[PDB]
CSV table of C-alpha atoms in Angstrom, one decimal:
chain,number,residue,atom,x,y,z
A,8,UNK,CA,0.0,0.0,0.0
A,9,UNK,CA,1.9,3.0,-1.1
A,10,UNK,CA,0.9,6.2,0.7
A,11,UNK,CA,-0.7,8.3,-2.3
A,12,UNK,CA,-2.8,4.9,-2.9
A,13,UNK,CA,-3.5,5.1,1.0
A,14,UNK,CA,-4.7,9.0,0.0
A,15,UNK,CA,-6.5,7.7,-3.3
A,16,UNK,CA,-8.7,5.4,-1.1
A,17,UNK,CA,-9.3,8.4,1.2
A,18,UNK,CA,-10.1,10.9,-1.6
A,19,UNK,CA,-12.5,7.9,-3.1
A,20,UNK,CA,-14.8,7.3,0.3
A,21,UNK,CA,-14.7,11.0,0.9
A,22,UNK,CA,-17.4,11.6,-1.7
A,23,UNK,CA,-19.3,9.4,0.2
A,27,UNK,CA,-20.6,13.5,0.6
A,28,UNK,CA,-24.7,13.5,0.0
A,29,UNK,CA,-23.9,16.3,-2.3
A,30,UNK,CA,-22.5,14.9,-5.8
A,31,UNK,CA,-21.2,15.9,-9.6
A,32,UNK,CA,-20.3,13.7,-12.6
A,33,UNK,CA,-17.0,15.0,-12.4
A,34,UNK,CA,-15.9,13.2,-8.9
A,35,UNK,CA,-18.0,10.0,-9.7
A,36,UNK,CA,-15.7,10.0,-12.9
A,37,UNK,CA,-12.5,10.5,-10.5
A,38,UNK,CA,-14.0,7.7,-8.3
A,39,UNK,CA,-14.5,5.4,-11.5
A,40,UNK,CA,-11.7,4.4,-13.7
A,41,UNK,CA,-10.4,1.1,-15.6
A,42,UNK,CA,-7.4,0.2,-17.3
A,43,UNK,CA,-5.2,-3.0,-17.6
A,44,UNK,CA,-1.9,-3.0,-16.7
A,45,UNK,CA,0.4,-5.8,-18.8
A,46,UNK,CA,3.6,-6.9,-18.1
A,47,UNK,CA,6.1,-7.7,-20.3
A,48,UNK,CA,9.5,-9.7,-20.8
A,49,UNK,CA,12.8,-9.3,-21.9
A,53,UNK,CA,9.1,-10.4,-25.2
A,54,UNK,CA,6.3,-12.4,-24.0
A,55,UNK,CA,3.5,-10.6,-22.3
A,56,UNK,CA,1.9,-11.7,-18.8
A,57,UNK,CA,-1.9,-11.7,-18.7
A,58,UNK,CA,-3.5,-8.7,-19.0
A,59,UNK,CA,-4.4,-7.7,-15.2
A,60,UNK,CA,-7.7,-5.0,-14.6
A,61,UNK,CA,-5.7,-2.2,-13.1
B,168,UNK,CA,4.2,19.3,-24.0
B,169,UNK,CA,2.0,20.9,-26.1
B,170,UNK,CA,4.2,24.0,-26.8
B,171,UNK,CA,1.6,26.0,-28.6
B,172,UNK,CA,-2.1,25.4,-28.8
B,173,UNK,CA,-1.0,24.3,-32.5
B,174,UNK,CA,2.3,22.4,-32.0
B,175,UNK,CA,3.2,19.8,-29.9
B,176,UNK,CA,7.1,19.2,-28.9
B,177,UNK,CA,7.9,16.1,-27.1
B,178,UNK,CA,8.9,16.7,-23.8
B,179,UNK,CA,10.5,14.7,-21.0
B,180,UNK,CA,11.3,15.8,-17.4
B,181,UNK,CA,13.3,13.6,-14.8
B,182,UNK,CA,11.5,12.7,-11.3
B,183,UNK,CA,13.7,13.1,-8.6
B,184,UNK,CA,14.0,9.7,-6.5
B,185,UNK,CA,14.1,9.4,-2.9
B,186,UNK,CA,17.9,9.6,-3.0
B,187,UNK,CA,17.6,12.5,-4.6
B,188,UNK,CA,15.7,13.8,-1.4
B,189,UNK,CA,17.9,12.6,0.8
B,190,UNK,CA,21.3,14.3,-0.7
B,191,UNK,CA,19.7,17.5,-1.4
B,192,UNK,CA,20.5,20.3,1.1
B,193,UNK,CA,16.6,20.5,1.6
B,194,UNK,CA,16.9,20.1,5.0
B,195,UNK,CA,18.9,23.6,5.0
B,196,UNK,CA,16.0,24.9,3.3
B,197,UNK,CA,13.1,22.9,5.2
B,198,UNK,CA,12.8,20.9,8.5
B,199,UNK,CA,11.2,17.4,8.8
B,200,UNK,CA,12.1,15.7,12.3
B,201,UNK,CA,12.9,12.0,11.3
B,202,UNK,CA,10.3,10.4,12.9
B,203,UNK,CA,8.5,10.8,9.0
B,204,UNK,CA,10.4,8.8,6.8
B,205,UNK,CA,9.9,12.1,4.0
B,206,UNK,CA,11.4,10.7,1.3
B,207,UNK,CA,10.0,7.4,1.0
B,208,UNK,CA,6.4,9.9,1.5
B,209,UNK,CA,7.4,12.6,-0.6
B,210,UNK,CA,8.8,10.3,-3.4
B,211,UNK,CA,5.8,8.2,-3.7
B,212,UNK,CA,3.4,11.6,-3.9
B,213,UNK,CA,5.3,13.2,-6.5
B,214,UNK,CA,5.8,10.1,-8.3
B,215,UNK,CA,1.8,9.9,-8.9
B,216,UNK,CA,1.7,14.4,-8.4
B,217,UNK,CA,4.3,14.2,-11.6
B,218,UNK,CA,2.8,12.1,-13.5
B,219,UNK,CA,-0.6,13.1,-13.3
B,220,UNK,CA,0.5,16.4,-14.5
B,221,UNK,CA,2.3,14.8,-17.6
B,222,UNK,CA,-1.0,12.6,-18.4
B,223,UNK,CA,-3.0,16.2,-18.6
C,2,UNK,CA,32.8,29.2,70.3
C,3,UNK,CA,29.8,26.8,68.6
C,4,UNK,CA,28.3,29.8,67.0
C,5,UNK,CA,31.4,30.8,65.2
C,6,UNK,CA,31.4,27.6,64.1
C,7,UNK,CA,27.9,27.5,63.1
C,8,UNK,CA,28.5,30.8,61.1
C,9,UNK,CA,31.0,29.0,58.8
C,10,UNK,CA,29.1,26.0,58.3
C,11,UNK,CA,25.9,27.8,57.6
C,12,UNK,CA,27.6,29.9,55.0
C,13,UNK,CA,29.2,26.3,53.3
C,14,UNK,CA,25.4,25.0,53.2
C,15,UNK,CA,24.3,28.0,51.2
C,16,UNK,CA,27.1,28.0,48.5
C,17,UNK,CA,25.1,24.3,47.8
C,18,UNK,CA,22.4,27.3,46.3
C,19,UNK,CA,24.4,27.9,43.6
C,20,UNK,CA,24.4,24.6,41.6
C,21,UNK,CA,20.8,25.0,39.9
C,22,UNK,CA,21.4,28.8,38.6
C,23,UNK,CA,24.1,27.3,36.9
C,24,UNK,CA,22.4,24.6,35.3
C,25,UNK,CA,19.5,27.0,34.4
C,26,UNK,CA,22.1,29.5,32.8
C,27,UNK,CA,23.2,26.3,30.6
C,28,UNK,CA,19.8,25.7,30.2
C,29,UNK,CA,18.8,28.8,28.6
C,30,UNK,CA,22.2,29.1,26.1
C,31,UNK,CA,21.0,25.8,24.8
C,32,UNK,CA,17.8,26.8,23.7
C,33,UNK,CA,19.7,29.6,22.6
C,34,UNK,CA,21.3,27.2,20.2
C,35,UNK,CA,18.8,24.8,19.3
C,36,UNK,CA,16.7,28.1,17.6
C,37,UNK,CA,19.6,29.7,16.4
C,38,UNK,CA,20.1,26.8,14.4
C,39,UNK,CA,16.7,26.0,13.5
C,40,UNK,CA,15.9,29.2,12.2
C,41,UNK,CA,19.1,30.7,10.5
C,42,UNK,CA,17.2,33.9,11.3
C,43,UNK,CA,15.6,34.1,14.7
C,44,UNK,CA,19.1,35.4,16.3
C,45,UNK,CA,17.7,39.1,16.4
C,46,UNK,CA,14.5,38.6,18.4
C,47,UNK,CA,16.3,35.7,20.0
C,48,UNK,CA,19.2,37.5,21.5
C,49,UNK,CA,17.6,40.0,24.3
C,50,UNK,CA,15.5,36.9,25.1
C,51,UNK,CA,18.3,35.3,25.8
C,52,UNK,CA,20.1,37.7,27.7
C,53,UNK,CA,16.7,38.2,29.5
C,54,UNK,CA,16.6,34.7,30.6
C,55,UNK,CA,20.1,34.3,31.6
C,56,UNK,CA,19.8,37.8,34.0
C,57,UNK,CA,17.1,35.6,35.8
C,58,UNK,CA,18.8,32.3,36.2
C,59,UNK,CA,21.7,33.4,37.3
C,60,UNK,CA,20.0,36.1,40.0
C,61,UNK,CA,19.1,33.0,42.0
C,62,UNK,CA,22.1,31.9,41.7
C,63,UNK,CA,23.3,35.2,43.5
C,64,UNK,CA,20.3,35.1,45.8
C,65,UNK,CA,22.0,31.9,47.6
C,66,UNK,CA,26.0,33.7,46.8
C,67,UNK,CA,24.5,37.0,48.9
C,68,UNK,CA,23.2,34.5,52.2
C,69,UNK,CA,26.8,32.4,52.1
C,70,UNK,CA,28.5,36.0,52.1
C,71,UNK,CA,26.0,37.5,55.4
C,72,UNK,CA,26.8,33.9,56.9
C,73,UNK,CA,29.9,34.0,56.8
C,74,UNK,CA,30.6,38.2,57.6
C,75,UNK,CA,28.1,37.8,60.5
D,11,UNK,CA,0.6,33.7,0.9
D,12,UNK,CA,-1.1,30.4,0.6
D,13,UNK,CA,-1.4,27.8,-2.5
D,14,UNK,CA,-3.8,25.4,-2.0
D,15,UNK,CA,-4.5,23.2,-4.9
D,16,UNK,CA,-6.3,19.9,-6.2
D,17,UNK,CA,-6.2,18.1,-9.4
D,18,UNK,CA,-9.4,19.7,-10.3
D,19,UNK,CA,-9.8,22.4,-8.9
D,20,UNK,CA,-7.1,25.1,-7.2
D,21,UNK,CA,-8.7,27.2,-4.2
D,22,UNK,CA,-6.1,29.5,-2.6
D,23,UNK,CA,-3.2,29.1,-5.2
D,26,UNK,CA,-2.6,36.7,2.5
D,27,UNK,CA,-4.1,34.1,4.2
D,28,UNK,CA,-3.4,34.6,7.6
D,29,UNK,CA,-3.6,31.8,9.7
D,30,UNK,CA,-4.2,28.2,8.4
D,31,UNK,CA,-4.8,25.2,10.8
D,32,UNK,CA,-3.8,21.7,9.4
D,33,UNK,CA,-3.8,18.5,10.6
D,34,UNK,CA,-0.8,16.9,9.6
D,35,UNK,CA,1.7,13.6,10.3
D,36,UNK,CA,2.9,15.9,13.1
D,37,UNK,CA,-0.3,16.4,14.8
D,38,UNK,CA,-2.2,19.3,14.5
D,39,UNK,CA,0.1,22.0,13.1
D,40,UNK,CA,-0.9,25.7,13.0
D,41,UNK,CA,0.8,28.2,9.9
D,42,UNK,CA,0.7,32.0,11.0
D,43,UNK,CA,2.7,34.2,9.3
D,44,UNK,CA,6.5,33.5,9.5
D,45,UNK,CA,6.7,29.6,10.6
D,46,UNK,CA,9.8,27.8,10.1
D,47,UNK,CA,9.8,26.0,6.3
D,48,UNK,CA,8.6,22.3,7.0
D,49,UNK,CA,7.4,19.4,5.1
D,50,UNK,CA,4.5,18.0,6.3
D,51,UNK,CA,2.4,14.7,5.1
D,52,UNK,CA,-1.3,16.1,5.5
D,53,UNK,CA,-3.0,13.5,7.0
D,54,UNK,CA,-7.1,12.8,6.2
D,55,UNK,CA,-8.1,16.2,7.8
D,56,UNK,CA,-10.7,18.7,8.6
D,57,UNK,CA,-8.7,22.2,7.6
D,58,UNK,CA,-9.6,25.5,8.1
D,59,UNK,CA,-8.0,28.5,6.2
D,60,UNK,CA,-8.3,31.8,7.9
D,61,UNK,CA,-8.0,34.8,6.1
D,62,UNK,CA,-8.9,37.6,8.1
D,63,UNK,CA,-11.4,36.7,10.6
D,64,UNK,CA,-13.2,34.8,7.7
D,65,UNK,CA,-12.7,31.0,7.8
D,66,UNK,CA,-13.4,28.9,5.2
D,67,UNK,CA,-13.6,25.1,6.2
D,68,UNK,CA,-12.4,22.3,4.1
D,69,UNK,CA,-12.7,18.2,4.3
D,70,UNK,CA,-9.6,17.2,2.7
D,71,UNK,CA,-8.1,13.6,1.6
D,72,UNK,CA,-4.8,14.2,3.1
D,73,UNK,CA,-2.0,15.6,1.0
D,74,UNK,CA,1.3,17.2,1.6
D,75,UNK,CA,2.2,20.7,3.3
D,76,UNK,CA,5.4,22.5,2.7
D,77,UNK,CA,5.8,25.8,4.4
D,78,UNK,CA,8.4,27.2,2.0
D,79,UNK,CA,11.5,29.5,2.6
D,80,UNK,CA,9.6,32.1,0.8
D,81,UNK,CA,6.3,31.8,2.5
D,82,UNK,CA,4.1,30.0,-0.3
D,83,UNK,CA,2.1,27.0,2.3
D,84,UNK,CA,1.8,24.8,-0.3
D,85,UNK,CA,-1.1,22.5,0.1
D,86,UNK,CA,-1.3,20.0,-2.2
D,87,UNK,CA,-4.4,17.9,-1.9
D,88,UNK,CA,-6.8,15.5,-3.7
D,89,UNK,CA,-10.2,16.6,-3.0
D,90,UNK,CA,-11.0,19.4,-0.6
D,92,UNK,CA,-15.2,22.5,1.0
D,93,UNK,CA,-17.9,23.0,3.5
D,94,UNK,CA,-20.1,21.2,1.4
D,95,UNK,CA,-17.4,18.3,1.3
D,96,UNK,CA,-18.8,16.8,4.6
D,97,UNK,CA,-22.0,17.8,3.9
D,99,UNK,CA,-24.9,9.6,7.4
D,100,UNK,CA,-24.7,7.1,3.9
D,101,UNK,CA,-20.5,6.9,4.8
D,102,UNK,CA,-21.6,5.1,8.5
D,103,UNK,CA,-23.9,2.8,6.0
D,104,UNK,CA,-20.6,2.4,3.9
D,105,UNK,CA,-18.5,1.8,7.0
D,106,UNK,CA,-20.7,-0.9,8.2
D,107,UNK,CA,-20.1,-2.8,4.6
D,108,UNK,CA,-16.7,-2.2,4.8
D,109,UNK,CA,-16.3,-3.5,8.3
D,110,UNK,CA,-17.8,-6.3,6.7
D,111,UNK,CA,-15.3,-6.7,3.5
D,112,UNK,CA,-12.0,-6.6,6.5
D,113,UNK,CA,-12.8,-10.2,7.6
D,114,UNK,CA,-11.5,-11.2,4.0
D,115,UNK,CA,-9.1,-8.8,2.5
D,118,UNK,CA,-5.8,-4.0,0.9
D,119,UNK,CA,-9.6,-3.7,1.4
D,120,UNK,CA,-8.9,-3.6,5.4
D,121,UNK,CA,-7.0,-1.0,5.0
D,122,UNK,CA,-9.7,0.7,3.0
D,123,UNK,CA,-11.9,0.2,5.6
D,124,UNK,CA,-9.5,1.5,8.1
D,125,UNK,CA,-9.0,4.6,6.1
D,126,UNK,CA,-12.9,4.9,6.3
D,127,UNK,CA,-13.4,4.3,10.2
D,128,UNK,CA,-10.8,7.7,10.4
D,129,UNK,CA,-13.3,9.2,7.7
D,130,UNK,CA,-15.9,8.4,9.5
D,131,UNK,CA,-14.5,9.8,12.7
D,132,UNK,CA,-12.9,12.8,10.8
D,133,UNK,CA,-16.8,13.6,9.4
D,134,UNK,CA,-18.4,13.0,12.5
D,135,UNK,CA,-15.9,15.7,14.4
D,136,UNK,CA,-17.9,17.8,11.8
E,1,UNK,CA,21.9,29.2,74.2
E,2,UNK,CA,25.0,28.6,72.1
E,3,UNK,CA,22.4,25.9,70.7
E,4,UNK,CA,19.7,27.9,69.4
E,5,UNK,CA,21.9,30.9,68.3
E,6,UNK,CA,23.9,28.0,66.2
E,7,UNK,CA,20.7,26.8,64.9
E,8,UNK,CA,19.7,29.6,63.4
E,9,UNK,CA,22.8,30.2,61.1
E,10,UNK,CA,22.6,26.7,60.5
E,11,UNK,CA,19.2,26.0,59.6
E,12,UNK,CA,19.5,29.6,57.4
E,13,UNK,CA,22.2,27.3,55.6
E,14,UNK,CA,19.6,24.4,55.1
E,15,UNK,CA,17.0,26.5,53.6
E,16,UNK,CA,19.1,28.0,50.9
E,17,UNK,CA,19.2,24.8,49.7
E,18,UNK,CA,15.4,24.7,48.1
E,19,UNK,CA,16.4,27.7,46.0
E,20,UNK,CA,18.4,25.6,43.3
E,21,UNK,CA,14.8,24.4,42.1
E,22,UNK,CA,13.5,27.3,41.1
E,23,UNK,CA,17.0,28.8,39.5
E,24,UNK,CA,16.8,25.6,37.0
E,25,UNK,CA,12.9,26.2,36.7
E,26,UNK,CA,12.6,29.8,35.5
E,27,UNK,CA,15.3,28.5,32.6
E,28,UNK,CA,12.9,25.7,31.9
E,29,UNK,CA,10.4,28.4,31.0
E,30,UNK,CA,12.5,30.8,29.2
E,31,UNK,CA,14.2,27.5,27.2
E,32,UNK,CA,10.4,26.9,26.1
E,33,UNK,CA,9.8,30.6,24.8
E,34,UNK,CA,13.1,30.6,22.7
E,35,UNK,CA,12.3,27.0,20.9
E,36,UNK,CA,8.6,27.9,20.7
E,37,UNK,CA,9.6,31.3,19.5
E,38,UNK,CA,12.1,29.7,16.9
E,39,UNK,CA,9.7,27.4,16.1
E,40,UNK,CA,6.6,30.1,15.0
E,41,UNK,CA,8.1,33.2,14.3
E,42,UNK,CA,5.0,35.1,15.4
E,43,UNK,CA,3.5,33.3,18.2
E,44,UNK,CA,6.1,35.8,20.2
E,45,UNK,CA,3.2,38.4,20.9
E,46,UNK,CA,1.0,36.0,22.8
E,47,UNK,CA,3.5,34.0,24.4
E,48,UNK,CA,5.8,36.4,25.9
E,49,UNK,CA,3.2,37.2,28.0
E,50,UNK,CA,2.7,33.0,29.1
E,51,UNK,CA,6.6,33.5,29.5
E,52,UNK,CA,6.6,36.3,32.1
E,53,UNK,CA,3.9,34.6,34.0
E,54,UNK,CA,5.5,31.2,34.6
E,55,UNK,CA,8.6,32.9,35.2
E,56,UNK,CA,7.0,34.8,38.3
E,57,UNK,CA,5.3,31.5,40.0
E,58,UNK,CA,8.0,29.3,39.1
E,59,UNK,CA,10.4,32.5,40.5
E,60,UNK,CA,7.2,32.7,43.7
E,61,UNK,CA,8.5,29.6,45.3
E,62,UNK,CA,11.9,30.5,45.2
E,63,UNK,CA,10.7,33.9,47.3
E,64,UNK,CA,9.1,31.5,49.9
E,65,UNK,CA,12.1,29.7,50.0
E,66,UNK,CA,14.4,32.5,50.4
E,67,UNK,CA,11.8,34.2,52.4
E,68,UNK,CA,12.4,31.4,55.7
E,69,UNK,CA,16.2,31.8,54.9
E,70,UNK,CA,16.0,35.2,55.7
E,71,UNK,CA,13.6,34.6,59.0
E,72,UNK,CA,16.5,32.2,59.9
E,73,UNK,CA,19.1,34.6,59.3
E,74,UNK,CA,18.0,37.5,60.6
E,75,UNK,CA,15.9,35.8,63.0
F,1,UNK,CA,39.6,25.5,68.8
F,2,UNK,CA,39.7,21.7,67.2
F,3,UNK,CA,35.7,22.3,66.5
F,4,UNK,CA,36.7,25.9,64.9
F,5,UNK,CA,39.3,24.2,62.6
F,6,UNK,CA,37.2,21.3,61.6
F,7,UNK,CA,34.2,23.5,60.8
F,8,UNK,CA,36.3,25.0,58.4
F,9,UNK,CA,37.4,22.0,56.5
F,10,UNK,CA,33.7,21.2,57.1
F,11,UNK,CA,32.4,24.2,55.6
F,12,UNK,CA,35.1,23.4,52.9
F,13,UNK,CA,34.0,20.1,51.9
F,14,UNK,CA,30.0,20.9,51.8
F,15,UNK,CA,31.2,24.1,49.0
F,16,UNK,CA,32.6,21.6,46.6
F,17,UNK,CA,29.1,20.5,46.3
F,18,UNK,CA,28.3,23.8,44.4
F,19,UNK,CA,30.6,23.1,41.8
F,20,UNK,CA,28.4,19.8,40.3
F,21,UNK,CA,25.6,21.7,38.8
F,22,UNK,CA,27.7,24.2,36.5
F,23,UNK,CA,29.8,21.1,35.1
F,24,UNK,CA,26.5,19.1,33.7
F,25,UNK,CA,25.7,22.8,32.8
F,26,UNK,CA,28.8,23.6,30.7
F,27,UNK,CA,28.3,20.0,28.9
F,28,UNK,CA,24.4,20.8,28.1
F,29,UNK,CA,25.6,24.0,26.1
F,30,UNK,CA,28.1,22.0,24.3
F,31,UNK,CA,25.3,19.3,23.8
F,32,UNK,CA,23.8,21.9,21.8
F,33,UNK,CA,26.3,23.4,20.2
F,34,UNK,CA,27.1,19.9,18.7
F,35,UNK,CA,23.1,19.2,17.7
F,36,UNK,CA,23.3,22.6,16.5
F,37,UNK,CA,26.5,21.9,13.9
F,38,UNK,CA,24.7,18.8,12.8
F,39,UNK,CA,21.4,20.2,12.3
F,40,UNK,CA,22.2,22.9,10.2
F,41,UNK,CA,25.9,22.1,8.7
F,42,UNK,CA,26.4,25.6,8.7
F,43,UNK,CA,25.4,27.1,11.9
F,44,UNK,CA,29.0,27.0,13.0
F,45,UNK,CA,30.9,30.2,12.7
F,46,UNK,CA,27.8,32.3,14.6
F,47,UNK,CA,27.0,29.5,16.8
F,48,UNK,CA,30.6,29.2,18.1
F,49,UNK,CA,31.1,32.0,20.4
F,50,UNK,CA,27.9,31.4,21.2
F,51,UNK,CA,28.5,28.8,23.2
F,52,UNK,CA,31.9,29.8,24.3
F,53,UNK,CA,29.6,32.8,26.3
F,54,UNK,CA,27.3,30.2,27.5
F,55,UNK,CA,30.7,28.4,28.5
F,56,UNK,CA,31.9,30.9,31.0
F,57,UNK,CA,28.8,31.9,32.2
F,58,UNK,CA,27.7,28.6,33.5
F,59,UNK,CA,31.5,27.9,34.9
F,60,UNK,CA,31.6,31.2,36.4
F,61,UNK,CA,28.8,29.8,38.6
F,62,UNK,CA,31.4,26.9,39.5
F,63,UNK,CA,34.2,29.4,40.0
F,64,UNK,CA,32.0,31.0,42.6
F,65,UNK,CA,31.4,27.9,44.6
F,66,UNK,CA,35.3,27.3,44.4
F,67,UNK,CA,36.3,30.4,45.6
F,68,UNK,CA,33.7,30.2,48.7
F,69,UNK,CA,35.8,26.7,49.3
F,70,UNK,CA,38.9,27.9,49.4
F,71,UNK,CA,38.2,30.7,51.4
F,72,UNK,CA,36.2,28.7,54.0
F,73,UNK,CA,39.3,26.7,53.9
F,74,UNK,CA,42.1,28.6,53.9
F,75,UNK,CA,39.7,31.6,56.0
């Protein structure tokens, strides 16, 4: 747990607060996948 | 880095690692006690801070 | 007689006084230190405090000097 | 002078007096302070400028009191309206989720949100 | 006689003792104002006030002290 | 006469007493002058005499205790 993922995870339940906009549900809701990658082949594709 | 709203110059920047934090006189020039371990903090925040800034 | 003695012994027993005015004085020039160097630049409000604060320390100090002197005169 | 930004959205980037709450405690800025780095921990701030406060709910960040006097917050999401009951629903789910799993963390992170909103 | 008038100049001696407490406590308060002062360049205009006052208490038992000392002594 | 020349020696040994409290006091400004050094790197040249003043002041407070000893000693 690295510390700015400790203050993502902070920023995320803090708009849980009634009061609400797009903008932070979009900054609350992302996706990606993250691949690794040899020295070549490719590990499985993991969800960020 | 886009230079001019209609150019675009590739740009690269270097981020400073925690070493670099810890051999900078930045302690003549700020004060942490040592109880904070403020590189291994401050790396990690400017690490996402910095990039963040080069993904907009 | 006994009381002349007493006299000189009362005045050693004071001169005991003088110990924790010196430590204070100590006390106060290391603080002195520790913000001198944790500012770079506190030195000028700083240094009448200082001064301030070692006048007082050490005027216990003479407080217990003054009593060993009477004791010891009369 | 006080710089006090977000991703989205940059608020004081003086001030007079700004009240933190920080790796170091609570940590008060007036004026001259010595220049420190601070880790801002999951906080309820208040920025004084004048007598007029301005109250902020804030994710936890970093301070640095320059050598120049720029307090440069740095934060992810900061106002009043920022605390302003479903997050003590959301904590009891949470609770819930630590019996299995990073996610106890989470939920550790909430219980000092929870806390943190409830001091407001 | 030679008894009491001893005791006096003695027990003056003994009382002079308590003195060294307060001598080391009004630099504990002054150490606390330069740090503090270092510290928050500005909180100087409220806390030299705080300063003054704990160095008259923490200086007010040294008087009581010094106070008997002089009943002995001169009494 | 023997009690008048043993109260002196007496009165002697009790003012070396005295002298304890200035040398942890001497060491305490050095203390800082040494955290001080290593704090800043560059505190040094200011700092110095610094605590060469605080030096003398706090053995001064020694010197006075000695010179009480020595003249409840000698007389």
């Amino acid at each position: 747990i690295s510390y700015a993922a400790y203050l993502n995870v902070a920023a995320q339940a803090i708009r849980s607060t009634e009061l609400q906009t797009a903008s932070v549900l979009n900054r609350s809701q992302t996706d990606a996948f993250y691949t690794q990658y040899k020295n070549a082949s490719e590990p499985t594709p993991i969800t960020k | 880095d886009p230079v001019s709203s209609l150019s675009f110059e590739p740009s690269e920047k270097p981020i400073f690692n925690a070493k670099t934090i810890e051999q900078s006189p930045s302690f003549g020039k700020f004060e942490i006690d040592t109880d904070a371990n403020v590189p291994r903090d401050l790396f990690e925040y400017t690490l996402a801070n910095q990039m963040l800034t080069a993904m907009a | 007689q006994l009381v002349l003695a007493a006299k000189y012994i009362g005045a050693g027993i004071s001169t005991i006084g003088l110990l924790g005015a010196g430590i204070g004085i100590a006390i106060v020039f290391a603080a002195l230190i520790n913000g001198v160097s944790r500012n770079p630049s506190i030195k000028d409000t700083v240094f009448p405090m200082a001064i301030l604060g070692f006048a007082l320390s050490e005027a216990t100090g003479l407080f217990c000097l003054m009593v060993s002197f009477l004791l010891l005169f009369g | 002078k006080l710089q006090f930004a977000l991703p989205h959205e940059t608020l004081y980037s003086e001030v007079t007096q700004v009240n933190l709450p920080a790796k170091s405690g609570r940590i008060g800025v007036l004026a001259n302070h010595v220049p420190t780095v601070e880790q801002l921990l999951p906080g309820v701030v208040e920025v004084m400028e004048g007598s007029n406060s301005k109250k902020f709910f804030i994710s936890g960040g970093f301070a640095t009191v320059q050598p120049d006097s720029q307090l440069c917050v740095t934060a992810i999401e900061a106002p009043l309206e920022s605390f302003s009951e479903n997050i003590k629903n959301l904590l009891a789910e949470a609770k819930k989720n630590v019996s299995s799993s990073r996610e106890a963390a989470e939920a550790a992170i909430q219980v000092e949100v929870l806390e943190n909103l409830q001091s407001v």
